[model samples]
Target: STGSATTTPIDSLDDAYITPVQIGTPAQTLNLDFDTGSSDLWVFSSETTASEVDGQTIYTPSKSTTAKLLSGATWSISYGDGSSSSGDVYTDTVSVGGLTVTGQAVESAKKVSSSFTEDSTIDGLLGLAFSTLNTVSPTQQKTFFDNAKASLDSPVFTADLGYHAPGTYNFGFIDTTAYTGSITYTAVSTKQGFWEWTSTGYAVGSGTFKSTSIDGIADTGTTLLYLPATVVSAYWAQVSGAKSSSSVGGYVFPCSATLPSFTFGVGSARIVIPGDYIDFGPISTGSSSCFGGIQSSAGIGINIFGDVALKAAFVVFNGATTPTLGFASK
Candidate 1:
């Protein structure tokens, strides 16, 4: 609970996809990564000479007259995942979907790695997360959303991501399509980084599970649902017909019989993760039964529930008034 903040839970739906935002005149479109952990909108520039850059799109600022580069404000950022990039600050007229945000701050990456530098379609990342986690700024400052929150449609933002496909990561209005569904809410734990919670336990297919609890975090940036050790062992115990494979990180299980359902408790909020998550096919290691819900984090503090977990419920992040988090499907 180090980087977690107060959030409002919401009822999420099955169909959700995020669209790119247009910024600058003559419009440079960027596939925005709505990350709550940080706030900053960065796009790789066509000026870059690399072949690919971590599935990032490339932008050409030199073509736009509205683009103004901050002569001396260049910055470089490196994440725990070993991804890094460097760029300069620029001001321009920006727009997301059909909404136009004028005088928006943008980052133009001059140099990036092959993971990011190589990608031609991925223009850049739109940091809609928070000002505190921004990686680029004149003063190494906060994100555009943070500094320009007052001008945005709403003071808050929300992200609803998927496991393999692009999920909905929106701002301002909370889409109520899933509210009428069968969803629930749980108060967010007062932690830091992404919104994390305490998991009561899990059950695989129709297996018997022990009453165990694990710490978990919800993140859109990550694609896999990573659980702790004890919790995985407890849940796997229910899969009597299934066998854990140490040959492939010990998370995958293959059973001749069907598995049971798994339920987790987040305080008063009880939600169940889908069974498809048991094996990471498109997201993580291919065709491997990675740990069902919990795995060895090497003593990490909390478990990370990625897009797979978030897609289960609609999450409403109200950064407008006291920053409330609401979850529902009810």
Candidate 2:
């Protein structure tokens, strides 16, 4: 079945987007981060320790008659930011918008890191990466999207992330009205359990575009765009007041500085990221200093095209035999 859902930005925190999803027979709704960087449909459940629950809503599988425990099964995962969650597994009905999949693996968190527990707005994560990356022990599990693919009109999903605005996550079909211009398609490699692709090159401001082939993953869960240290330094150098502030971390610039746009090449298509978006709000709310959204991916090994970059375009995650990425100007 074809389906679509509205993705909204969190109040106050404009970093990540959330989509509503239903679980179990009675349908316990939760706002989840539809992440393409990892694979695991984990949730803040009744099994979560009281100390780690925080203000997030928890899913009670026992309330749903359709919930069934997966014998001898468990899951554990740790993110790049040090956030983690682990728990037992349950098979239940999982639905997104108008589509539904029965017997989908629902990981009930028994423990969560401070990052997740402290963030009361995010109830859980709906991973959209390859199923091979699932953390379930002994027998791996398929994601809700993978389980529902056969019933979908097409094996595809579109991410329309917005900056301080409402966006959308569409499944099974692509909406032509969501984007402008032709979608430039590029081959994607799932070897790393991510939607990994190589960009032809990039340029800071209106300067000459460099042929520096950068390999990165399209990660909706990540907040900022991470590139090579050299690339990030070059971009910061263009700003008169930009500097690597030890207090604020990453690159910082004057709130009044006239920033330049960063452009990335995908074959012949040029995806331009406006400079204003890079000035991620203010350093401390009522401050004149601002933190740069584009940072160095030095220690991370691979670059990440996070929400800051993804929001500038309409992305199509094609799950064909040869998975591909289709990008169009928003």
Candidate 3:
């Protein structure tokens, strides 16, 4: 059977989208960030210290009759942004939309880093990456998709993330109506526990598309697009006011600066990110200063096609044998 869920942006922070998920027998609903970058269904739970828990809701496994603790098992995860969370594990019935997966491992966060603790709106994260990346100790745990794939009519899911608007995450089925034109399929390499792919080349504004290859991951959890320093320099060069700012720790420019669109090649297809989207809003309290959505990926090694780039097109995370990523204009 197929299922779907609506995802909403977190207020002014267009950084990530959150979707409601039901866990346990009685079903404690929590808003979780559906992250494709990592594999671990972790939640803020009763195990967390009261002082550490901010305004976020907690999942009480003891309240659910079906909840079972996997003795001696624990899970911990760290993100590229330095955020980390670690906790114990519980097996429970987890549901997204109408699809249900029983005995799914739910990591209950007992400790979380300041980054996560400060973002009180995000109660937890629902990992959609390959189950091989799951951090559960003793034995690896399967993600909701892995556990439900066998029952799905087709093992696939689609992400339609939008800017300042609501988007949909469809599971087991593709809503062709959600996209425009034909879908371009690209091969994915799961060697690093991510939806990694190589781009044929890219171009700035109306410039000619280069033939340089760039390897990156389709990371929905990340907010901005990260490319090689050379590529970033080329793009920023087109904008008169754009420059690297040590204070901002990225490329910043006047908010009113006319920016150039970025286009990346995916196989034979080219996905263009509009210029307006490249200006990732204000840099700080000063509305006149803005941060470029595309930045250098030097430190990270792997380029990231984050929300800024992904929202420009409809994306398909096809989990079939030799997983492929399908992209199309929305």
Candidate 4:
């Protein structure tokens, strides 16, 4: 049997997706961001400094009979966004959907960045990336997926992220009805920490596809799509009054600009992202200038196909002996 869970976007831009998780005996339920980009599963908890705790829920280990502290074990994680969290480790019965994994590593946060503490919608992150990126010291802890894979009917998981709605995550098998068209499978790069893949090519709106291989990662935790400077410049050029404004940050254009759609390839399959998805809303609360979702990844060094792209397709993170990735139109 496979496990399944539903994740919903937090804001209008679909900044992050949150999924409910159950931990320890008499299970305390917490909503965690299911981030495919990062690899450590850390949570806001009672161990966190009281002054830093805003409205977020905290995981209490003392209340769980099965919770055991991993003596001498510690973990710390710093994200690309400059926000971070760190703490000691615990092994407890952790469950998501209907699948239960005994001795799952749960990193309880003793400290967190202001951005994390301020955002109360998500209690923590449930990392689905490879275990090699886990931050636990003295001993590396396996991610939730890594620990649960052996018991799953098949070592695989699916991400169905939405635009402004809720999506589903299936632990072992794919939902035949979740997607349309045939799923095109592609080879996944090994020894890398992310679900990295190379796109066959891309096209802006109705223009001819630019036949160039683009390397990027399918990151559910990230909000916008990032591409190489040349590709990003090509897309922005089509927009009116679009400029890479320093004050506004990145590329911004008039809110009413008629934006063109962005399409990307997966093997032989092509997935099109609607133009408004790239419009990314206003730079300020009521500003007339809007931000672009598809921006240059030059500063980041690597391209990231965040939720802006994943929202257009049904993604599969296959953990077979030789790992692979699958994409299908929805």
TM-score per prediction, in order, is: 0.75, 0.97, 0.98, 0.98
Task: Give lDDT for model 3.
Answer: 0.91
C-alpha local distance difference test of each model: 0.56, 0.91, 0.91, 0.91
The RMSD of every model to the true structure, in order and in angstroms, is: 6.3, 1.1, 1.0, 0.9
Q: What digit string (tens of lDDT, one per residue) describes model 4 on residues 99-164?
A: 999999999999999999889899999998888889999899899999889899989999999888
For candidate 2, write residues 1-330 as lDDT tens digits.
Answer: 887899999864467788999998899999999999989999999999999988998899999999999999999999998789999999999899978999999999999999998889899999999999999999999988889889989899999988788999999999999899999999999888999999988999989999878999999999999999988998999999889877776898888898899998888899999987787868886999888889999878889999988999999999988899999998
Q: After superposition, how far is residue 166 of candidate 4 from its true place, in Å?
A: 0.7
In candidate 2, stretches whose alpha carbon ends up further than 4 angstroms from where it belongs are: none
| Model 4 clashing-pair count | 0
lDDT tens digits by residue: candidate 3, 14-117: 87899999999799999999999988999999999888888998999999999999999999899999889998999999999888899999999999999888
Scored by lDDT, model 2 comes in at 0.91
Q: For model 2, name the residue pairs that clash.
A: 1-151
The Cα error of candidate 1 at residue 240, in Å, is 6.1
lDDT of 4 at 330: 93
Badly placed stretches (over 4 Å) of model 3 are none
